[PDB]
Amino acid sequence: VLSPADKTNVKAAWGKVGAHAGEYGAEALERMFLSFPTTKTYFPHFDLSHGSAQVKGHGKKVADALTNAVAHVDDMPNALSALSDLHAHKLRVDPVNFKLLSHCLLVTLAAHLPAEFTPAVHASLDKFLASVSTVLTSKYR
Amino acid sequence: VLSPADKTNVKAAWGKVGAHAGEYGAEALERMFLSFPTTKTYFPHFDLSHGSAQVKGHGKKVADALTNAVAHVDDMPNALSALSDLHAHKLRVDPVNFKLLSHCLLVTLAAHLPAEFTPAVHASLDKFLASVSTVLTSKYR
Amino acid sequence: VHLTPEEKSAVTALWGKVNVDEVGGEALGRLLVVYPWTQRFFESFGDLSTPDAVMGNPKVKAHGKKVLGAFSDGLAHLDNLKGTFATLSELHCDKLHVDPENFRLLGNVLVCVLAHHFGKEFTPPVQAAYQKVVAGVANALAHKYH
Amino acid sequence: VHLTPEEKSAVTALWGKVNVDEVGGEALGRLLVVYPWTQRFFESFGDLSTPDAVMGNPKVKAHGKKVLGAFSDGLAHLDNLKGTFATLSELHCDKLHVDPENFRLLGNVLVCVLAHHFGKEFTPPVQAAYQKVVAGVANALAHKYH
Ligand code: HEM
Ligand code: HEM
Ligand code: HEM
Ligand code: HEM
Numbered sequence A, B: 001v002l003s004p005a006d007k008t009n010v011k012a013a014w015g016k017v018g019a020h021a022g023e024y025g026a027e028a029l030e031r032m033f034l035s036f037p038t039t040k041t042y043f044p045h046f047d048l049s050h051g052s053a054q055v056k057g058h059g060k061k062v063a064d065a066l067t068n069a070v071a072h073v074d075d076m077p078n079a080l081s082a083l084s085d086l087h088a089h090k091l092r093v094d095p096v097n098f099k100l101l102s103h104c105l106l107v108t109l110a111a112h113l114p115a116e117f118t119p120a121v122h123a124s125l126d127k128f129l130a131s132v133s134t135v136l137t138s139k140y141r
Numbered sequence C, D: 001v002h003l004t005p006e007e008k009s010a011v012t013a014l015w016g017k018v019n020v021d022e023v024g025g026e027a028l029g030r031l032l033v034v035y036p037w038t039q040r041f042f043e044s045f046g047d048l049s050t051p052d053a054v055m056g057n058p059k060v061k062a063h064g065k066k067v068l069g070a071f072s073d074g075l076a077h078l079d080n081l082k083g084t085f086a087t088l089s090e091l092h093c094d095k096l097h098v099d100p101e102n103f104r105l106l107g108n109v110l111v112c113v114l115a116h117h118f119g120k121e122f123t124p125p126v127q128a129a130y131q132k133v134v135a136g137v138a139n140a141l142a143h144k145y146h
């Protein structure tokens, strides 16, 4: 459950990503695949090499889904219902992997937005990503 | 995130629990303190002995909180805001301990409900208790 | 793991009453129902699409017998769980890459199934002893991650 | 922990640029801010009531230097982490009763701090190597729990 301060922090920090969405999402995925190679099992059809155009385009979809989640922060089960159906019903992603990608997203934000990535904002982004992860791992329809 | 079927199961199962909810809350606490003795550090002034009147009185409080959460299952952050402040802001309970108590409540229900603790009911109650735990460990008030 | 001599007696006494043909399948079945991402590891087992399908699935029941047999082995070698589970640890960690939180979940589902079967006989002290066992089994299975 | 020769070199080169007086306090502070229940273990440090109070707390900064020195010791003994952290494991497990998931959290906060400090220099391959290090440290610290 996010506080008003959390939502303020997440909107402020994530809004600075902007058109870096695809690059930063792709970087977070690459960090995850390199740091936690077990995650690659969910992407068998993917070219996962460093500058892969598949990963770059998928990263943009992930980042934009997060932007949508930020806009609907008070309404995430509804806004993300299709993604929950994909990740929880169809893909059956083990919840641990959401913690790995969420951590790699925080690392990516920290590496690119040092002034923005304060302890308070770090803490809010962690809760936000945890909240997204709960929706994507729940079967609620 | 609870499905409509989860909410149906939780309301039905907690109805079957009925007037025994307070007893089961006290039994879950006793199970937690014995099985996971690190949880006792949160209750330094309690008589934690088997069958203590203090644990029986606290179990009634825990159960009444859960009954209220079942009645407000669509609105738990609002229903539990004061309990969240106590557990997350004041007591700073490690979220691992909520998984321990939730498990001990499930064990208690299994031990008392041989005719009604179906796999679907078990699954729905687990999601309910995980949702309550998230609310009580979140700082949003 | 440790377990007092009284805890050892309580554990083995209850296990002597456990049905070896069914309890393992019930624990694995409830794991698949309660934590449905675990179904991703069992596609060869058939229809898992409803709780009724899971709990009646013949491959779940048959495999569950082997899971329970591994727990029985643990109970017979409580002072060397790590060695007892060495082959299974390499299987689950190096071959299957099962995340070790799921070992703890299955152990706790087994505790729930024991409580379901034994009712008031599954006392808090009996449970506390079994929690030591299933924590030890889970840690032993995760050893190849350490 | 198994680092390739290239990973060990990249890990060592980066760690040689770490401010030994600050990075540990930054990592410990962020642990206390991002995961506020960890504050329960550090009530003797005084005012932890707001993020600014945590990050400016002199006891946090001073203890953080000791934490960072323990990570430094791990980096100097990558092939014997369990022996290096045996005494720290008994302290954190047998005495303080820190649930071991929190070990993983501090390691990942340290990784976030390195990324924050080094920016684009904290490349994905350098992070991958640091993740192996902090996993090894957390596993070694949890060794006496088992
Ligand atoms: C914050 C967390 C996550 C978000 C916001 C997210 C979002 C998305 C989006 C937007 C898509 C594509 C939807 C479409 O193209 O129609 C997708 C697909 C996918 N995601 Fe995630 N995801 C997350 C976490 C994860 C994790 C942790 C894994 C596994 C390690 C995962 C595995 C997949 C897979 C396998 C696909 C399908 C790719 C394909 O075959 O096209 N996701 N996700
Ligand atoms: C389903 C989970 C839980 C529920 C519904 C719950 C509910 C409650 C309730 C109703 C109270 C009394 C509130 C009052 O007196 O105003 C309380 C107090 C308390 N709870 Fe929880 N609780 C839960 C989990 C936990 C856990 C896991 C811990 C720690 C292991 C914990 C530690 C405490 C403590 C220390 C108190 C204060 C006792 C006192 O000093 O009187 N609670 N909780
Ligand atoms: C924690 C206690 C567990 C025990 C004691 C256990 C025990 C076993 C045993 C005895 C086997 C058969 C090995 C053989 O015949 O060579 C097995 C196989 C297997 N286990 Fe586990 N297991 C546990 C947990 C898990 C969990 C949590 C998962 C996944 C979520 C899992 C997934 C599997 C799979 C996928 C197989 C191979 C099944 C097949 O395709 O034949 N196990 N396990
Ligand atoms: C990789 C993770 C960690 C490392 C390397 C580490 C390292 C250390 C070191 C070197 C000390 C000083 C020991 C001494 O003075 O003899 C210490 C003490 C301590 N640690 Fe940790 N630690 C870690 C994780 C944690 C976590 C996650 C917690 C709690 C959430 C924790 C709680 C404490 C406490 C309470 C003390 C005593 C502080 C005091 O009162 O002076 N540690 N740790």
Ligand SMILES: *Cc1ccc(CO)o1
Pocket: A001, A002, A127, A128, A130, A131, A134, B134, B138
């Ligand atoms: C609001 C909140 C913090 C963490 C979570 C996990 O679902 O939710």
Ligand SMILES: *Cc1ccc(CO)o1
Pocket: A134, A138, B001, B002, B127, B130, B131, B132, B134
């Ligand atoms: C609906 C749901 C499942 C698990 C959780 C944790 O908050 O919530």
